[PDB]
Paper text:
Here, we determined the active structures of FFA1 and FFA4 bound to docosahexaenoic acid, FFA4 bound to the synthetic agonist TUG-891, and butyrate-bound FFA2, each complexed with an engineered heterotrimeric Gq protein (miniGq), by cryo–electron microscopy.
In addition to R1805.39 and R2557.35, two other polar residues from ECL2, Q148ECL2, and Y165 ECL2 are also close to butyrate. Y165 ECL2 forms a hydrogen bond with the carboxylate of butyrate, while Q148ECL2 interacts with and potentially stabilizes R1805.39. In the structure of FFA2-butyrate, Y903.29 forms direct hydrophobic interactions with the short chain of butyrate, while Y2386.51 forms hydrogen-bonding and cation-π interactions with the critical arginine residue R2557.35, potentially stabilizing it in the appropriate position to interact with butyrate. The opening between TM3 and TM4 of FFA1 that allows for binding of TAK-875 is closed in FFA2, resulting in a small orthosteric pocket in FFA2 with limited space to accommodate the carbon chains of fatty acids. In our structural model, H1404.56 forms a hydrogen bond with E1825.41 in FFA2, which is replaced by S1855.41 in FFA1. The H1404.56-E1825.41 pair also defines the size of the hydrophobic pocket involving C1414.57, V1444.60, V1795.38, and L1835.42 in FFA2 that accommodates the hydrophobic tail of butyrate. C1414.57 is located at the bottom of the SCFA binding pocket and forms van der Waals interactions with the last carbon of butyrate. Nonetheless, we observed inward movement of TM5 and TM7 at the extracellular region in the FFA2-butyrate structure compared to the ligand-free structure of FFA2-AF, which is likely due to interactions between butyrate and the two arginine residues R1805.39 and R2557.35.
Author numbering:
A (entry chain G): 6 to 62
B (entry chain B): 2 to 343
The structure:
């Protein structure tokens, strides 16, 4: 029976996944907001560049 | 009595990680970014229409130069488009017309294709003979190919329908590492910008974050109620978004190990076929089965603009490397390039 081996490997996978350092959601959301704000000016979809600079004009 | 206690321990560990995620979730993305200025209505115009395919388009990938794109159709052809002038650089006739994925190498020398033929063929664009010929046909996947991405000119990671993702060595043709753990068919994968990690969404409503060198899954994300059709990494590589069949897009986070925002609307009932992020990661473009292509706000979950003019179900979506334009391909064998204007 291979069910025991599958259960053991699943248990080991969960054992590995549990021991992971998780930061608070506040810091992660702050990092995402900082990245979005820093590259806002360089985004030609957030802030449409003038039509003279669009390669697809 | 042996496997029963093992499964009880597995359930206890799952509850433990669930409550750890709950405890680490002090707030949510909704209240944190509620004071940010909304992007407003986003108007995108079909600047170019890359007509030429004679069958439904299933995948496309932008080049690194943000000018060339490969599109694969069930016509049996992979056409490399000069999106600036809508010119067909190449027209590679595939061995099998059942192609469900395609990729463009970061160096631009190689392209890949795969599908129901179980083989991830790799084509060499730059050859002394002047034509495009298949270099290495990667075989070893039991299930249909779903998504292939290029690590380098010699390493490519593929996701198949046999519940397994594989890292391939093009020079030798053998799977360097094999990724296992998915219960349902793996439908898409997205390489991290730092190239050292990649996530893969499967039909078991779970996205697993793997490691290219370690070779086994590092984190597993759940929350979807149906199959996951698409996945993309937030530009910083610390988050990703999933497109599923239950008409919702979810923004998971690698570091927080839990979902941050869901992109759902009562009007939309059809699933998502492809997702892609903007250059700054603020706009998440998702392709639905209602022939439309929404442009969600990553930090606001607000419908901001619709790429409505596609006449059929959009199956692939791709934002340029510099974020200049968005190309969406559909089952009407049309590729349309969209970008905003002031």
């Amino acid at each position: 029976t291979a069910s025991i081996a599958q259960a053991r490997k699943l248990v080991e996978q969960l054992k590995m996944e549990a021991n992971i350092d998780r930061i608070k959601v506040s810091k992660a959301a702050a990092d995402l907001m900082a990245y979005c704000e820093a590259h806002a000016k360089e985004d030609p979809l957030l802030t449409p560049v003038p039509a003279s600079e669009n390669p697809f004009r | 009595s042996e496997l029963d206690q093992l499964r009880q321990e597995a359930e206890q560990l799952k509850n433990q990680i669930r409550d750890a995620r709950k405890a680490c979730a002090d707030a949510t993305l909704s209240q944190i970014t509620n004071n940010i200025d909304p992007v407003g209505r986003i108007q995108m115009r079909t600047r170019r229409t890359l007509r030429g395919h004679l069958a439904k388009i299933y995948a496309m990938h932008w080049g690194t130069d943000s000018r060339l794109l490969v599109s694969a159709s069930q016509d049996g052809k992979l056409i490399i488009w000069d999106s600036y002038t809508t010119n067909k650089v190449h027209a590679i006739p595939l061995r099998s017309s059942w192609v469900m994925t395609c990729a463009y190498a970061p160096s631009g020398n190689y392209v890949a294709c795969g599908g129901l033929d179980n083989i991830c063929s790799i084509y060499n664009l730059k050859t002394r003979e002047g034509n495009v010929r298949v270099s290495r046909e990667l075989a070893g996947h039991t299930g249909y190919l779903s998504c292939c991405r290029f690590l380098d000119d010699n390493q490519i990671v593929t996701s198949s329908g046999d519940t397994t993702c594989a890292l391939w060595d093009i020079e030798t043709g053998q799977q360097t590492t094999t990724f296992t753990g998915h219960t349902g068919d793996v439908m898409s994968l997205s390489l991290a910008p730092d190239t050292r990690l990649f996530v893969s969404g499967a039909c078991d409503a779970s996205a697993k974050l793997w490691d290219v060198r370690e070779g086994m899954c590092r984190q597993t994300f759940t929350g979807h109620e149906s199959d996951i059709n698409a996945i993309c990494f937030f530009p910083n590589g610390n988050a990703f978004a999933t497109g599923s069949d239950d008409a919702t897009c979810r923004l998971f986070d690698l570091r927080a190990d839990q979902e941050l925002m869901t992109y759902s609307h009562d009007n939309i009932i059809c699933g998502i076929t492809s997702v892609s992020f903007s250059k700054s990661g603020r706009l998440l473009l998702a392709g639905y089965d209602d022939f439309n292509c929404n442009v969600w706000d990553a930090l606001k979950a607000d419908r901001a603009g619709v790429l409505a003019g596609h006449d059929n179900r959009v199956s692939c979506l791709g934002v340029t490397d510099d974020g200049m334009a968005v190309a969406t391909g559909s089952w009407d064998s049309f590729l349309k390039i969209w970008n905003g204007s002031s």
